[PDB]
Write a protein that binds this ligand. Sequence first.
Ligand SMILES: [Zn+2]
Length: 46
Amino acid sequence: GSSGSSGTGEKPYKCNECGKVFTQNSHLVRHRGIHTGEKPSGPSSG
Ligand SMILES: [Zn+2]
């Protein structure tokens, strides 16, 4: 049984596929390119 205390400072723009942030939204979108049409396996809980 572990506790939270996991995660320090999280940007308002993060990826759900792998888990990455960006200084801007535009950038984030570009990244998704690696996921788009690339073994897209969405999570179960959200
Ligand atoms: Zn990603």
